[PDB]
Structures are given as structure tokens and as C-alpha cells.
Amino acid sequence: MEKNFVISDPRLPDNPIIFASDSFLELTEYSREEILGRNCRFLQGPETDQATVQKIRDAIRDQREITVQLINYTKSGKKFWNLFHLQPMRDQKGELQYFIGVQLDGEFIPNPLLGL
Numbered sequence: 001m002e003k004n005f006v007i008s009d010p011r012l013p014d015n016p017i018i019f020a021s022d023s024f025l026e027l028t029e030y031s032r033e034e035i036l037g038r039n040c041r042f043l044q045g046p047e048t049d050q051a052t053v054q055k056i057r058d059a060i061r062d063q064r065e066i067t068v069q070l071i072n073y074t075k076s077g078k079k080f081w082n083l084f085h086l087q088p089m090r091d092q093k094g095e096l097q098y099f100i101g102v103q104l105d106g107e108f109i110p111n112p113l114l115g116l
């Protein structure tokens with residue numbers, strides 16, 4: 001099965017990526033060594049809806065799962081629609097341990113409907 005996903009450590013400054021799947025590197029055209037320890041916001045760009053980024057920010061604050069569709073950019077500057085699913089991961093004692101984010105590329109919801 002193909003799966004674009006990255007894993008971040010919220011107990012380190014600014015939620016850095018500590019693991020990225022091979023297909024994520026394939027989709028984003030980045031190498032593994034140039035995104036490790038990065039915040040995933042580097043995928044955003046001029047066309048990224050800031051109102052959608054705000055929804056992600058609130059979901060991380062409240063440590064709840066969320067699904068949004070937003071524009072992301074590859075290393076070479078190509079735009080692609082990203083159906084992004086974020087999920088909190090807790091340990092045996094109920095403490096937040098990781099965030100996992102899954103990316104599906106494609107304009108699943110038509111943008112004229114997404115803008116409403």
C-alpha cells in the first residue's frame with residue numbers, strides 16, 4: 001500500500017518531523033535529510049489558504065484530529081491539492097506523544113465548493 005505520512009515530535013521545539021515515508025519524499029520531491037527536524041509548514045506557499053492553516057493550528061492546540069484540503073508545493077514549485085489528515089498519538093499514560101499526518105494528493109472537493 002502507498003502511504004504519504006510524516007511523524008512529528010510535539011515535545012521538541014516547533015513540532016519537527018522525525019520520520020517521513022518514502023512516498024512522501026516522492027510526492028514532495030524532497031530528500032529525507034533536508035526535511036528531518038523541520039516543521040511541515042515549508043510545504044505551504046502563496047496560494048495556501050491561511051484560514052485552513054488556522055484550522056490546523058487550532059487542532060494541534062486542542063490535540064484533536066482534523067481533515068482539511070489545502071494547496072501545497074513541491075521542491076520544484078509545483079502546486080498540488082493535499083487532502084491532509086492529522087491524528088494525535090498518545091502513550092500508555094494518556095500523554096501526547098506524536099502527531100501523524102497523512103497526505104492524499106488530488107482535488108477531491110472542487111475548489112469552487114471549497115471556497116464557500
Ligand SMILES: Cc1cc2nc3c(=O)[nH]c(=O)nc-3n(C[C@H](O)[C@H](O)[C@H](O)COP(=O)(O)O)c2cc1C
Nearest residue numbers: 006007008039040041043044053056057099100101
Ligand atoms: C504531523 C504533521 C504533519 C503536517 N503535514 C502538513 C502538510 O503536509 N502540509 C501542510 O500544509 N501542513 C502540514 N502540517 C501543519 C504545519 O506543520 C503547521 O502546523 C501549520 O502550518 C500550522 O502551524 P503554523 O501556524 O505555526 O504555521 C503538519 C503538521 C503536523 C503536526
